[PDB]
Amino acid sequence: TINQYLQQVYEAIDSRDGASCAELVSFKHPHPEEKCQQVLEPPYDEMFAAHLRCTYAVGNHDFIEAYKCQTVIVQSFLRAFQAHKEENWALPVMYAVALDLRVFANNADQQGDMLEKAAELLMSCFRVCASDTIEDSKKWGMLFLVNQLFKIYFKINKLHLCKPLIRAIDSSNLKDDYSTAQRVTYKYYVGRKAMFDSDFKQAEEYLSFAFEHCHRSSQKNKRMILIYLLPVKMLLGHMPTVELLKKYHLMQFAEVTRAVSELLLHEALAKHEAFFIRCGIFLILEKLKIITYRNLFKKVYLLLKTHQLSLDAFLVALKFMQVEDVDIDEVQCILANLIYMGHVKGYISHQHQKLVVSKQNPFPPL
Amino acid sequence: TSKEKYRLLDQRDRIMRQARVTDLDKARTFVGTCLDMCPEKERYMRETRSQLSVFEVVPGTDQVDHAAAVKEYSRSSADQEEPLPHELRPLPVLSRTMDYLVTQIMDQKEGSLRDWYDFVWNRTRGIRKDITQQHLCDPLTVSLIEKCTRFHIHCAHFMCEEPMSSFDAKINNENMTKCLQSLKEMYQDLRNKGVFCASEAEFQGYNVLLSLNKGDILREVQQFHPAVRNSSEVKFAVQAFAALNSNNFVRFFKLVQSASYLNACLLHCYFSQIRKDALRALNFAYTVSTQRSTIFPLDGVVRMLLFRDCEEATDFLTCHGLTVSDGCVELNRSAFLEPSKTRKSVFITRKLTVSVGEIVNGGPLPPVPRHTPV
Amino acid sequence: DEFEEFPAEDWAGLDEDEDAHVWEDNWDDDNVEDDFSNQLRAELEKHGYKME
Amino acid sequence: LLDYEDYVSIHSSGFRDFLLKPELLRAIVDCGFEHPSEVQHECIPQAILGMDVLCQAKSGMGKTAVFVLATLQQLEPVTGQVSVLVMCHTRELAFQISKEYERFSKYMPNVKVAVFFGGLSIKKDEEVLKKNCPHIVVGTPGRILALARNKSLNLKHIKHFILDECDKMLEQLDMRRDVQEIFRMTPHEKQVMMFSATLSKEIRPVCRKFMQDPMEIFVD
Numbered sequence A: 001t002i003n004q005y006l007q008q009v010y011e012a013i014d015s016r017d018g019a020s021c022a023e024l025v026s027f028k029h030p031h032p033e034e035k036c037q038q039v040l041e042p043p044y045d046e047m048f049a050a051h052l053r054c055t056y057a058v059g060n061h062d063f064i065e066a067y068k069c070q071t072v073i074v075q076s077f078l079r080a081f082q083a084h085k086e087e088n089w090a091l092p093v094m095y096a097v098a099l100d101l102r103v104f105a106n107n108a109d110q111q112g113d114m115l116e117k118a119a120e121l122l123m124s125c126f127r128v129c130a131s132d133t134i135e136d137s138k139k140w141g142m143l144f145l146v147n148q149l150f151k152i153y154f155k156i157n158k159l160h161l162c163k164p165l166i167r168a169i170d171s172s173n174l175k176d177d178y179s180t181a182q183r184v185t186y187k188y189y190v191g192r193k194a195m196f197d198s199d200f201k202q203a204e205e206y207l208s209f210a211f212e213h214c215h216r217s218s219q220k221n222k223r224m225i226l227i228y229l230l231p232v233k234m235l236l237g238h239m240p241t242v243e244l245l246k247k248y249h250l251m252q253f254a255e256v257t258r259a260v261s262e263l264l265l266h267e268a269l270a271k272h273e274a275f276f277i278r279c280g281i282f283l284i285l286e287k288l289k290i291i292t293y294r295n296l297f298k299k300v301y302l303l304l305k306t307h308q309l310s311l312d313a314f315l316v317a318l319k320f321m322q323v324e325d326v327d328i329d330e331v332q333c334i335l336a337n338l339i340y341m342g343h344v345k346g347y348i349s350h351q352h353q354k355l356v357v358s359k360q361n362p363f364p365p366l
Numbered sequence B: 001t002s003k004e005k006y007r008l009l010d011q012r013d014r015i016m017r018q019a020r021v022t023d024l025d026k027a028r029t030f031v032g033t034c035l036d037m038c039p040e041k042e043r044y045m046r047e048t049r050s051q052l053s054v055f056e057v058v059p060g061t062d063q064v065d066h067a068a069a070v071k072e073y074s075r076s077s078a079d080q081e082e083p084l085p086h087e088l089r090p091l092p093v094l095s096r097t098m099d100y101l102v103t104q105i106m107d108q109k110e111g112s113l114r115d116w117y118d119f120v121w122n123r124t125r126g127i128r129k130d131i132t133q134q135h136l137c138d139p140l141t142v143s144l145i146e147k148c149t150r151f152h153i154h155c156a157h158f159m160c161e162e163p164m165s166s167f168d169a170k171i172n173n174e175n176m177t178k179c180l181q182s183l184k185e186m187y188q189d190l191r192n193k194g195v196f197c198a199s200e201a202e203f204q205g206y207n208v209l210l211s212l213n214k215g216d217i218l219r220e221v222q223q224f225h226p227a228v229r230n231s232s233e234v235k236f237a238v239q240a241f242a243a244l245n246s247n248n249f250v251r252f253f254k255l256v257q258s259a260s261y262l263n264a265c266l267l268h269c270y271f272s273q274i275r276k277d278a279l280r281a282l283n284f285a286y287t288v289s290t291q292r293s294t295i296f297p298l299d300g301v302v303r304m305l306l307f308r309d310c311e312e313a314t315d316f317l318t319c320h321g322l323t324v325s326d327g328c329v330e331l332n333r334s335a336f337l338e339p340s341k342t343r344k345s346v347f348i349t350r351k352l353t354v355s356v357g358e359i360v361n362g363g364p365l366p367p368v369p370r371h372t373p374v
Numbered sequence C: 001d002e003f004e005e006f007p008a009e010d011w012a013g014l015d016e017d018e019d020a021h022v023w024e025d026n027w028d029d030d031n032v033e034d035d036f037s038n039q040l041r042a043e044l045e046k047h048g049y050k051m052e
Numbered sequence D: 001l002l003d004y005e006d007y008v009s010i011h012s013s014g015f016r017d018f019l020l021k022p023e024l025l026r027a028i029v030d031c032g033f034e035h036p037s038e039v040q041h042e043c044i045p046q047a048i049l050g051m052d053v054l055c056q057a058k059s060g061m062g063k064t065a066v067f068v069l070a071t072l073q074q075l076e077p078v079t080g081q082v083s084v085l086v087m088c089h090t091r092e093l094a095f096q097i098s099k100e101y102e103r104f105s106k107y108m109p110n111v112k113v114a115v116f117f118g119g120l121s122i123k124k125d126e127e128v129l130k131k132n133c134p135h136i137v138v139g140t141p142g143r144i145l146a147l148a149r150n151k152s153l154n155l156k157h158i159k160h161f162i163l164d165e166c167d168k169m170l171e172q173l174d175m176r177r178d179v180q181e182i183f184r185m186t187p188h189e190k191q192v193m194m195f196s197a198t199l200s201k202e203i204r205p206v207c208r209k210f211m212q213d214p215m216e217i218f219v220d
């Protein structure tokens, strides 16, 4: 019972195995102050007494009160984490506690200021692991302490704090040698901001790294990276298949992948517009106006089939689409945008009001 | 004289400051009780040391105008924590302080503009910093912060050809960003309590119009309240935002003419960026190669790019490498080099039917307030 | 929208799966005779601009 | 006819969402201290991590606001131990820093600030230190030598080491040897700051020798 548990703490402390002590302090097991204080070192004396207090507060359903006990645990662990001079047996113990505090912030929100007060100490756990300066180093769990701040600061939406946290990890020697669960969770988040910074190519290498190495057993984590890849893909022009969307049972993009393949887009957009202002999606997903414009150019080019095409016909093809007040200056403006961005070759002549497209390679493939 | 009274009641202010000696919530923010428009101290202090506001003085010079002579800011690392009841005035006096500024000084009868901007600017920063210090949460004073916001948005166009000793537009833009940010921190905490606004989407449109070059503002458009997301001012703002990033200038300058007056000068903040991208795109578009040039007419470029006459368009068009001849411009790929003083574009200032103070008020002016400071 | 943690800390190169040819590009072809390109033909053949 | 042949990101965030303590969120606005410049906006998120900066700008921008609002945030209360050392070699600026430390610690009773400026001998500073032990020591380099050599100041728990106006510190000889000697009794893990009003080309390589992975702000 409690004495067998405490003898397990004694064996975990004396044999310095951090995986076993991380397993005993977690809630993954089935598994107050004087019994923990009569035998342990004074940071570990407060540590496991507050672990027992957190277990009793879970059993009381007092999730506000459990959070401050689970603050006393990690402050005592940080004081014990100071006490090991150039040694890192206690580094798997941190994954047992700093993963917990995030969700123990969330329940303390229910019964976000409390997410904030949880979010200011995990900064200091990053400070301690970033202070030490390879096989005995204390920096192996640094990137775990950036993937617990990133799962707080997108639930409050603060972005300006997290541009030395990217700079600390990205300028490091051991950044390509972390654990493979955390190095692919992180590579999503810095990819995700790279969608919102109009720097899509930086997000192209990362989330495709996040999609390809995601595990089979958790389909939801595959689905979320699929959701956030689908704006940055098909702006590049990846153009998914029906079988992918049927396999992940996510079929709302598919009609859009009809309308982006060749107004249809506005009707299919406003039919389910409440999904695309739910995950930060619609104002990203409107920017394929300029590639669906090239696909409508392909539809006019394949149906009229000569080199020089008059602009009145593309004006007619947009007057079918019928959104808001299209004229002849708007047509030639967005055609000039297509012709310098690189999607459409040729030149615009104003003397005859005809567009010449390229003869041997008409619209270059992306 | 005023000097001996200055020394006597400065001495009383000092020994009253020695009569007080600190926790998070035990010391309440302590609303002050001073009623007049410029304490009782500061007018005499500025009278002896010749720091006189050049508009509001008695016109025989010498005597400070005791009925009206408004305060200046002075960030000075003031070791005094901004006095006690005095120098910080309670909430009904703030509305009168803004009301006297919309009533008479922003309709300036005679005088220069350099002293006029400093006179109205350094005051409106004083009301802003004092409502910041005072810690008041009311729907009335956030409208006054929006009044200083509309004043800053109006002065972002009204003085642009003024000298660099007078305006220096960067610190004005850095102030006007913090104005609308004080609006956002005010109204998030106000909407979380459950108090809505009559004109929320107007300055949310001002916020979206202030940050087109910042790409994150797209995501900010997601987490609005759907009433203010579906409002017409924010829907003008998003359609204005989808003309930079897709680089559509014809639609952009069609949305200038259909805009309000105060939106048009925020569209004049991005004045030289749009036609730089437009003259890059049209020169790349209309040229078959890099060794010959094609004729573009002047009527098309003054129709598309909002240029109010031929002379401003031709000045912009020869100060970029191209050459204007008769009624045509020779668009050339090779001679387009990136190398100007900004101006007053008349199509914004013709969209103001009301007078200047009635622009800042956004409606009917109150009657002139009369006060007797004794 | 919460990105949940993975079940195990480490795995091999065979444990996860790809789906092979899903990020695929064959759509840039010259297939004219689809029905949505019929209506886009027909209104373009109602304004009297006619070509094969 | 003829065939075809083949920006600025201005600052946003206010002082509410840099993400400070409430004790530093009430006292930051009771002075009316508002509208951040780009120096605080680009320096404080990195300075709360424990990283190392070498920023410079002109007067009137708030360098001192940066190295109080970072270092009071990082300071845990230690029972009678010295953790912050600031050397600046100028007599008036020491009094400004020691007054504004008390201004910005409007809440904090446990944070005690003492300043050891110069001209008031050696034994008076030792009597000040023995009568009460402050957390924070501010003083001129030449005085804190003779305070450090005589085994009276415990310098083995220095966590933060802030230098202000280092341009006139390191343009003069026989004081860089003072800085190299006061550097050695500090522990190997610490945070070192650096602030100046002016910088040059001949001073750039030595200023990076006190810090690991530095970062640059230059107004230019």
Ligand SMILES: Nc1ncnc2c1ncn2[C@@H]1O[C@H](COP(=O)(O)OP(=O)(O)NP(=O)(O)O)[C@@H](O)[C@H]1O
Residues within 6 Å of the ligand: B075, B076, B077, D032, D033, D034, D035, D036, D037, D057, D058, D059, D060, D061, D062, D063, D064, D065, D165, D196, D197
């Ligand atoms: N954003 C701000 N708003 C209001 N007051 C400020 C702000 N920033 C700084 N101050 C005040 O302005 C005073 C002047 O500080 P400042 O001149 O910026 O120091 P400094 O730049 O280090 N001088 P120098 O060493 O010559 O460069 C400070 O002591 C603060 O009280």
